[PDB]
Structure 1
């Protein structure tokens, strides 16, 4: 997260870290046994880490749970990042408490202008590299369709939305991929892609979660 703030310990209790020897992506806990992330974050041998603030220090509220299976959306296109969504099932159920909690799926898509909360452990610089140890947060609005499509001509599908600031300086970045975009207390987006980070006229592009609720509910009810 570029140009954001320190969230504060366990004030984002649905945020997970995906670890394969090292943190590589975020995710969102949607119930005791399931995590939503980005399909582009797929790899085998994922450990999910819940209740994290400093990802480099055990502070005592963490739960480290292996993934039993991963289900990439059947229409995910890694060239276009269309349908950049994946479900990860935990080998055992998380203990839900004040520091580890699930986020609701949306019943409705969110409106342009809505301020959303985006979080993660990704890069904090738009030029150069500096990764944080503690969870960073950003408030950003959902941009209109027309300004999204103008920023990324011929690249935005109906399964994508833009959020952030056209002036630049504030954005998600790599290492944030897979993490949550929460608007009015519902998971509305997944950190997916963008051209650089926090660049002028190049806002973040997010997977539009409200398009996938049936698929999520179907898949979880059968796996």
Structure 2
């Protein structure tokens, strides 16, 4: 997250860190046994780390659970990143408490202008590399599709939306992929892609979760 602030320990209780010997992507807990992340974060051998704040220090509120199965969206296209979403089932159910909570799925899509909270342990420099150990947060609004499509001609589908600042300065970045974009208490997006980080006229692109609620509900109930 570039231009954001330190969230504070466990203030984003549904945020998960996907680890395969190191942190490589974020995710969101939707219920005690399931996590939603980005399909491009797919790897075999994932351990889900819940209740984290500093990912390099065991502070006492963590729960590290291995994944029993991963399901990438049936129509995920790695070349365009269309349908960039995946579900991960935990080997054991997590214990929900103050520090570990699930986030609600949306009943409708959000409007341009809605402010959202984006979080993650990704790079914090637009030009440079600095990976933080504690969770960073960013409040950003959903942008109009017109400004989104003008920034990325021929690359935005109906399963994506842009959020951020066209002026640059504030944005999600690599290391943040798969993490949550929560607006009005619902999970509306998943950090997916962009062009560099915090560049002018290059906002972040997110998977539009409201288009996948039926697939999510159906898939978790059958697995």
TM alignment of 1:6-21, pairs within 5 A: 6-21=6-21
Runs of 4+ off more than 6 Å: none
Compute the displacement of 1:61 (Å): 0.4
Unaligned 5+ segments in structure 2 are: none
* Alpha-carbon distance in 2 for matches of 1:110, 1:163: 11
Q: How many correspondences in the alignment?
A: 223
Unaligned 5+ segments in structure 1 are: none
TM-score scaled by length of structure 1: 1.00
- Secondary structure of the structure 2 residue equivalent to 1:94: coil
- Secondary structure of the structure 2 residue equivalent to 1:161: strand
Deviations 1:51-80 (A, max 9, x none): 000000000000000000000000000000
* Alpha-carbon distance in 2 for matches of 1:221, 1:36: 14
Match of 1:122 in 2: 122
- Secondary structure of the structure 2 residue equivalent to 1:217: helix
- Secondary structure of the structure 1 residue equivalent to 2:48: strand
Task: Say yes or no: does 1:92 pair with 2:92.
Answer: yes
* Alpha-carbon distance in 2 for matches of 1:70, 1:17: 15
* Alpha-carbon distance in 1 for matches of 2:90, 2:181: 21
Deviations 1:197-217 (A, max 9, x none): 000000000000000000000
* Alpha-carbon distance in 2 for matches of 1:217, 1:185: 18
TM alignment of 1:193-204, pairs within 5 A: 193-204=193-204
* Alpha-carbon distance in 1 for matches of 2:69, 2:179: 18
TM-score scaled by length of structure 2: 1.00
* Alpha-carbon distance in 2 for matches of 1:164, 1:145: 12
